[PDB]
Write a protein that binds this DNA or RNA. Structure first.
Ligand SMILES: [Mg+2]
Ligand SMILES: [Mg+2]
Ligand SMILES: [Mg+2]
Ligand SMILES: [Mg+2]
Ligand SMILES: [Mg+2]
Ligand SMILES: [Mg+2]
Ligand SMILES: [Mg+2]
Ligand SMILES: [Mg+2]
Ligand SMILES: [Mg+2]
Ligand SMILES: [Mg+2]
Ligand SMILES: [Mg+2]
Ligand SMILES: [Mg+2]
Ligand SMILES: [Mg+2]
Ligand SMILES: [Mg+2]
Ligand SMILES: [Mg+2]
Ligand SMILES: [Mg+2]
Ligand SMILES: [Mg+2]
Ligand SMILES: [Mg+2]
Ligand SMILES: [Mg+2]
Ligand SMILES: [Mg+2]
Ligand SMILES: [Mg+2]
Ligand SMILES: [Mg+2]
Ligand SMILES: [Mg+2]
Ligand SMILES: [Mg+2]
Ligand SMILES: [Mg+2]
Ligand SMILES: [Mg+2]
Ligand SMILES: [Mg+2]
Ligand SMILES: [Mg+2]
Ligand SMILES: [Mg+2]
Ligand SMILES: [Mg+2]
Ligand SMILES: [Mg+2]
Ligand SMILES: [Mg+2]
Ligand SMILES: [Mg+2]
Ligand SMILES: [Mg+2]
Ligand SMILES: [Mg+2]
Ligand SMILES: [Mg+2]
Ligand SMILES: [Mg+2]
Ligand SMILES: [Mg+2]
Ligand SMILES: [Mg+2]
Ligand SMILES: [Mg+2]
Ligand SMILES: [Mg+2]
Ligand SMILES: [Mg+2]
Ligand SMILES: [Mg+2]
Ligand SMILES: [Mg+2]
Ligand SMILES: [Mg+2]
Ligand SMILES: [Mg+2]
Ligand SMILES: [Mg+2]
Ligand SMILES: [Mg+2]
Ligand SMILES: [Mg+2]
Ligand SMILES: [Mg+2]
Ligand SMILES: [Mg+2]
Ligand SMILES: [Mg+2]
Ligand SMILES: [Mg+2]
Ligand SMILES: [Mg+2]
Ligand SMILES: [Mg+2]
Ligand SMILES: [Mg+2]
Ligand SMILES: [Mg+2]
Ligand SMILES: [Mg+2]
Lengths: 158, 263, 134
RNA sequence: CGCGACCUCAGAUCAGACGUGGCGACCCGCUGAAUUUAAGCAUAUUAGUCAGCGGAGGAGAAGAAACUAACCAGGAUUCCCUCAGUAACGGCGAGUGAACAGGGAAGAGCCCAGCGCCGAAUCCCCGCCCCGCGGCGGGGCGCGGGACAUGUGGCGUACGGAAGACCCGCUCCCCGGCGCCGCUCGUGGGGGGCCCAAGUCCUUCUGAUCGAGGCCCAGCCCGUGGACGGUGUGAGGCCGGUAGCGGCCCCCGGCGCGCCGGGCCCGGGUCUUCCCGGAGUCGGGUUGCUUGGGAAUGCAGCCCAAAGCGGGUGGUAAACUCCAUCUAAGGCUAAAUACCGGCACGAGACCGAUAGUCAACAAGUACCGUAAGGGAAAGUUGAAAAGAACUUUGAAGAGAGAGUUCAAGAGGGCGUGAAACCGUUAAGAGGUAAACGGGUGGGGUCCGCGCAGUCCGCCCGGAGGAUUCAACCCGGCGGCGGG
RNA sequence: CGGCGACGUCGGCUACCCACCCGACCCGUCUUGAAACACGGACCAAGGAGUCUAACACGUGCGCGAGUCGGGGGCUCGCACGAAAGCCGCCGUGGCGCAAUGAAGGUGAAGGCCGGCGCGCUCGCCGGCCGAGGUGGGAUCCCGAGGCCUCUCCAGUCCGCCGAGGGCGCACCACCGGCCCGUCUCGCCCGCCGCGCCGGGGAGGUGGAGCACGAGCGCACGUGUUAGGACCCGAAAGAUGG
RNA sequence: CGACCUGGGUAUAGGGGCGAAAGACUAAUCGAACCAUCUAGUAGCUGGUUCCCUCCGAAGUUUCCCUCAGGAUAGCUGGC
RNA sequence: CCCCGCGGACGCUACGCCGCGACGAGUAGGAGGGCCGCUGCGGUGAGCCUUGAAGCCUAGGGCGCGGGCCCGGGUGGAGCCGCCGCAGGUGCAGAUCUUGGUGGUAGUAGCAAAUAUUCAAACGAGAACUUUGAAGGCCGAAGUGGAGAAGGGUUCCAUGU
RNA sequence: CGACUCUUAGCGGUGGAUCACUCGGCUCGUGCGUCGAUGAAGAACGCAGCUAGCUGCGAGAAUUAAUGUGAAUUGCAGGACACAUUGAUCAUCGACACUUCGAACGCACUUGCGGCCCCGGGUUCCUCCCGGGGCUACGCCUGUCUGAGCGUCGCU
């Protein structure tokens, strides 16, 4: 029964909620398990960046966020074409590629291919057979200069 | 408690025309349990009233500014001999109460040389007080793995652990605290300020970076600055006795006028 | 203190493991100190008690320097019986009094190829620890 | 009017395989209420929930757009935060109720059919030989069988693909192994086993002690070990343990080098010429259910029933028009996520034997019911059985002595041992049932070091003792003040 | 000032028993009314009933403050404690607050004084200043004639108290103006890449949970209301499967 | 001597069965058996609701309600 | 310019202390205080304890308005409490309350359906009831007889207690 | 004087509260995340020198082997066991074994009855009896063999 001034409240507790309650006592353990898996993965991919592949520069869709730029799923096929990177070689050297994204304008397209050129210049490519370097990289550039990058590769800034 | 506790019975009420209370009774026969009350908080073997549940909101969140505030208050109180002695920390021969030692302590490896340092700092009396206070806890805590209780000793606050943790850690009462990870649960052990603290020199120098000055903000917390005083001069007797205060006062009325017996 | 996350410090769990221990680890639980002479001759401190070795009772009603030969290691009741450690019951027959092996001191060891193998095993590990901490 | 080939079927204890049933906490597909709320009640709510049925796995399902959007656009799925108690639904009442964008955890992509080209290039089985047995493979052989043109394999799949030319780059993969690895990597990888510090020191308490004093040296001894448990108390040093990028032994596994062996086969750019798609499906009507989806979100039944610059979507029905966006009706896929069942662990501001599981114990037991099913009560001698020898009365139960123990005023349902209730003893009382409040009195049990009653400051007198007082000197230390 | 004091007496009594005088019906509960011929209660022990979650509202305490808050994530020997604590800052995404109003398209909170001009036409181009108007109250604060002193006086030296009157006026209250959005009525102007069924402006009423120099956010505690078993016990029933 | 009595075997099962019909019988249960679950179903109704002292201290009336054993509302109360 | 005296009570946990004046009913209900009480956690008491913890008993001594608390004696035999905070499954006379135990009733109702027992002896500690013998009776062949089905499941039979 | 009754106290009973204890629960977290026709889960019946339950086990039956360990098990008894021409006990468990029901599988069960093929015995090969062993369920895939059809054809 209502009593004096108040708010008309409509709690959603008419549906046997006590049988489906998610407690979070395993939250500190889940953070530990995720952290251990992150560390194990970084050890597995030894000199490769710990975060993963490089992601493209992407503008957020709606009118609320189109002034903001974030990281996308992968570089479009038009971007890789004019950057001179094969769409099947890109994934093996740590470039994420999104075949379903198009480029409506040349400003965002050219900004992402400059991103690919800069990454391709920063990339140290270990020879497939360490005894025989074919076209990868000089031994001086990988003797000690190859370290595991931490955080996103070339993080996207506004 | 188990959510099934007291409710595994299939019991039902007997009705009202059978000269017994209308509580549910266990069905069937052939056993003591038959016809006995069930499901009630007043019934033996029943369900407790409002069974305790795991979603009780055990945790509290405190504002970061208030948690930083409490650390500053705890550190400030641990620099006053009256407050530390009122915790009972036996600091009587301690040479200086913001007690700072050289960095060589951080590289200790043996418990023997950790003991020798405390003895030469005249902090060993605090350890002997912890030894004297080792006794058995009273109550059900003994059945629940909290069998021994003892007093809290000094807090060794280091900057870099180069073996100092292992050199200590077998002395009862000693807790070691990284200066970058100060804990209010260790600095004010029972919620009372004034724990005896021994500082490594590197830790002592780093406090002005961690919490800042009033001139400059903290360089390791990115938005924190020391809290301000709402009373700069707390010397109440000095303020009251000051000639400018005394000039404005009327004369005291120190004559007691007791009840006059009406004759 | 204990830092191993897989070793328990729970009182109920420890008492359960103690009182339900299989007899092959009840042997290790029922160990006794060696005398100062044996602790010098072999570089060992403790030793599991054995059916034929000689001990002194150092605690209780039967304290003394009398050397008694162990005659029974009753692992089920966690006691050992010793030669002269006995009492008369009502009818006048003697019965051995059980004593925990932690309250005796071994003075002569019943030696065989297994005892010497264990004795050198314990001594070698102690020497390794001495030269690790040297 | 026989013999063959095929097609469609049948039998067999034919040769070799596979399925069934259980568990089911979590997951997938269905089916599916009512109590309840609406202060009645029928729509609604409960609730796509309980119950019912089926199917799995260590996860499952989902999943690489017939997507979101309308922007300067994003870009598989799943999970968290937020959107948001919002848009919306609703006897527009009670109530119900998402998504997009944004930030994060994780991050991974692909394969057919079709269209085509390639002498079916393809696959299974049975024999024979060889290397090995481990999840039975490799190699070779068989004018040895079968499958298969009613279509196997290679290329190839919307992100386009193919074939020819022209130019450029020869670039280097997988698997099974021998020797050794570095050995693995938060500090051997995992599993199992055996070990590794220091008081039972002196004096004492006690039934027993782990108790209490002490241990000159800077302080008994060790401490990277002062977690825990046991031991006749309450133990860092008595014992097991604990700590340690401690040691030793055995077994198993996943990352390279030198080499062995086998398969192993061309990639990109430009130009030209070609080739391109899933139908009783979409979609429409109607019906029933479902959804926040509202002139109909999804699902299904029946009827109608497609197209190819087509089709779907663009949250108000319809026509015209432009634009945007994807490419349905085939398939696979790890991770982040879930887990009241199971195996093995750790912990707790939880409970402490009417509590906590029903179950601390020969508990889903005893027992009850024809059955489905229902379902308890019940822990504690003592450090040690040392569990009362022996004498005596009695037919025995049971006693009296004696004995053990620190204690039987601990005697096998035996720690402590309340109340109700009962026996006996002692004191008091008693015809208005007891009991009670206030006020006294009598008696009684105890208490009071009760029984000649405090104490201590100064002064006076008496008789005695004395590191003997003030003032000075030396030294030490403080407090206060100083242009 | 008096008496009395150890194996008999002295003091005490809440407490034990007994006697007497006065008073006194058995508690709980519903009820206008219980001692009731109203119900429950033979006795004793142990157990036994406003709880937790979520959401609001107000009060109170704390921190920061036009902001505030890391709660989700991540980094920090992964781990006795520690599942804690600490930190992030281009992790503040986001929530709540900082703006309202309209069904919506949408629109969206500064005035006051002094001057020259069209006409100081109820007014349009500017100037100069100031920066939320005014009236009546208003704690506090400021000025203040005039007094209050000494052994006494002709004459000022320094400040302390009382003080009629006067002044600036916090918060808040009442009232009058003003501004923003909706909607009426009346009316005349202005703008221009789109000369329009275009856009803007004024005055006078009226509707708003508004403005008019912020007060919120987070945390904790209390009380109240609510949804949940919901303070505890209690139906006759309904449904599903056996 | 009959529409007779009776054993055993069978069949019919819950809104169902079976009834020479009484709502009879269906395992001491029948105007809808028993068992478990939904379920701690709902109750404006009955009963109970656990320590002390101090301070303040009511209402049974107004209006509306399928309202008349109940609520909302104003009043009366306390606290800040 | 106090000094033959070199000196002069207590106080003021300021959340304390002191003074003066008025007032004091209370159901439902609200509020405050609690050095009232229970359990557990963080601190603290160089706390207590086998020279005796908790618990319980007590014509023992007291304190407080009260909730309650302290102390003596006894029993008991191993743990417990004060203070500052924190947290509750935190206080019982009732609920035809739950479980357990115990009274009065009360040595009471009762041990009354189917005719019936008696004598002697034996064994035995013990005989109305056992056994043997002797009588007197009953079932009266549709039995109180002799055998089976269902059901029971060792009750069968010896010996012993 | 007693009895009876009441009150109080001492002692003794009855009873099992309280307190102390705890090899049990409850809650949270972690790592694994594994059944079955090669016969599961479950059930029944058996198995010890003395053994009813619980526990363990399967006619090899409170356990065999192997490995680790290294002198016990124990309530009583008995007997091993040079502990080196190897070993009590316990643990582990990879070898072996694992009765009858049960998806339960020859048919059927509140009972019981077949069939086929080998082996042994009475026979002294021929098939009757006794015993032993191996098979004998349903569905389904690939292949095989044997077939059916006035199904479609071909040759004659
Ligand atoms: Mg319970
Ligand atoms: Mg206690
Ligand atoms: Mg076959
Ligand atoms: Mg209703
Ligand atoms: Mg209702
Ligand atoms: Mg109804
Ligand atoms: Mg279900
Ligand atoms: Mg299955
Ligand atoms: Mg899957
Ligand atoms: Mg899928
Ligand atoms: Mg696709
Ligand atoms: Mg919101
Ligand atoms: Mg719904
Ligand atoms: Mg990420
Ligand atoms: Mg093909
Ligand atoms: Mg101990
Ligand atoms: Mg110890
Ligand atoms: Mg040791
Ligand atoms: Mg270790
Ligand atoms: Mg539309
Ligand atoms: Mg229980
Ligand atoms: Mg008890
Ligand atoms: Mg008898
Ligand atoms: Mg005793
Ligand atoms: Mg007893
Ligand atoms: Mg008595
Ligand atoms: Mg009543
Ligand atoms: Mg009446
Ligand atoms: Mg009454
Ligand atoms: Mg009457
Ligand atoms: Mg009556
Ligand atoms: Mg009544
Ligand atoms: Mg009654
Ligand atoms: Mg009662
Ligand atoms: Mg109680
Ligand atoms: Mg943290
Ligand atoms: Mg923002
Ligand atoms: Mg004003
Ligand atoms: Mg106004
Ligand atoms: Mg309210
Ligand atoms: Mg209830
Ligand atoms: Mg109904
Ligand atoms: Mg009728
Ligand atoms: Mg009910
Ligand atoms: Mg009533
Ligand atoms: Mg009065
Ligand atoms: Mg009063
Ligand atoms: Mg309670
Ligand atoms: Mg009671
Ligand atoms: Mg009688
Ligand atoms: Mg009679
Ligand atoms: Mg006759
Ligand atoms: Mg007969
Ligand atoms: Mg017989
Ligand atoms: Mg008694
Ligand atoms: Mg063996
Ligand atoms: Mg038959
Ligand atoms: Mg034919």
């Amino acid at each position: 029964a209502p009593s004096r001034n108040g708010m008309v409240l409509k709690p959603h507790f008419h549906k046997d909620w006590q049988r489906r309650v998610a407690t979070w006592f395993n939250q500190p353990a889940r953070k530990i398990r995720r952290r251990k898996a992150r560390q194990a993965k970084a050890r597995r991919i030894a000199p490769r960046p710990a975060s993963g592949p490089i992601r493209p520069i992407v503008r957020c869709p709606t009118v609320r966020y189109h002034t903001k730029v974030r990281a996308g799923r992968g570089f479009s096929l038009e971007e890789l074409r004019v950057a001179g990177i094969h769409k099947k070689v890109a994934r093996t050297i740590g470039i994420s590629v999104d075949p379903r994204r198009r480029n409506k304008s040349t400003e965002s397209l050219q900004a992402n291919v400059q991103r690919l050129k800069e990454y391709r210049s920063k990339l140290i490519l270990f020879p497939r057979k360490p005894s025989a370097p074919k076209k990868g990289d000089s031994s001086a550039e990988e003797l000690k200069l190859a370290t595991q990058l931490t955080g996103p590769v070339m993080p996207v800034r506004n | 408690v188990s959510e099934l506790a007291g409710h595994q019975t299939s019991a039902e009420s007997w009705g009202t025309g059978r000269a017994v209370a209308r509580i549910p009774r266990v069905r069937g026969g052939g056993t003591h349990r038959s016809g006995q009350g069930a499901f009630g908080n007043m019934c033996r073997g029943g369900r407790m009233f409002a069974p305790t549940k795991t979603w009780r909101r055990w945790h509290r969140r405190v504002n970061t500014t208030q948690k930083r505030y409490a650390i500053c208050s705890a550190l400030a109180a641990s620099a006053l001999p009256a407050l530390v002695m009122s915790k009972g920390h036996r600091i009587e021969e301690v040479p200086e109460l913001p007690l700072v030692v050289e960095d060589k302590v951080e590289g200790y490896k043996k418990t023997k040389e950790a003991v020798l340092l405390l003895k030469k700092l005249k902090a060993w009396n605090d350890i002997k007080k912890v030894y004297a206070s080792q006794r058995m806890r009273a109550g059900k805590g003994k059945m629940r793995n909290r069998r021994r209780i003892q007093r809290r000793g000094p807090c060794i606050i280091y900057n870099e652990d180069n073996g100092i943790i292992k050199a200590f850690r077998n002395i009862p009462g000693i807790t070691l605290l990284n200066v970058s990870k100060l804990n209010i649960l260790k600095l004010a052990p029972g919620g009372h300020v004034g724990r005896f603290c021994i500082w490594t020199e590197s830790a002592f120098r780093k406090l002005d970076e961690l919490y800042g000055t009033w001139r400059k903000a903290a360089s390791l917390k990115s938005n924190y600055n020391l809290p301000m005083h709402k009373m700069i001069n707390t010397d109440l007797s000095r303020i009251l006795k000051s000639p400018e205060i005394q000039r404005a006062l009327r004369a005291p009325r120190k004559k007691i006028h007791r009840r006059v017996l009406k004759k | 203190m204990k830092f191993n996350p897989f070793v328990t410090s729970d009182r109920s769990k420890n008492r359960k493991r103690h009182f339900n221990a299989p007899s092959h680890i009840r042997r290790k639980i029922m160990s006794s100190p060696l005398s100062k002479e044996l602790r010098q001759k072999y570089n060992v401190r403790s030793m599991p008690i054995r059916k034929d070795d000689e001990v002194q009772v150092v605690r209780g009603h039967y304290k003394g320097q009398q050397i008694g030969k162990v005659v029974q290691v009753y692992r089920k009741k966690y006691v050992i019986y010793i030669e002269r450690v006995q009492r008369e019951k009502a009818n006048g027959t003697t019965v051995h009094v059980g004593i925990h092996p932690s309250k005796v001191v071994i003075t002569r060891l019943k030696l065989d190829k297994d005892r010497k193998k264990i004795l050198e095993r314990k001594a070698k590990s102690r020497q390794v620890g001495k030269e690790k901490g040297k």
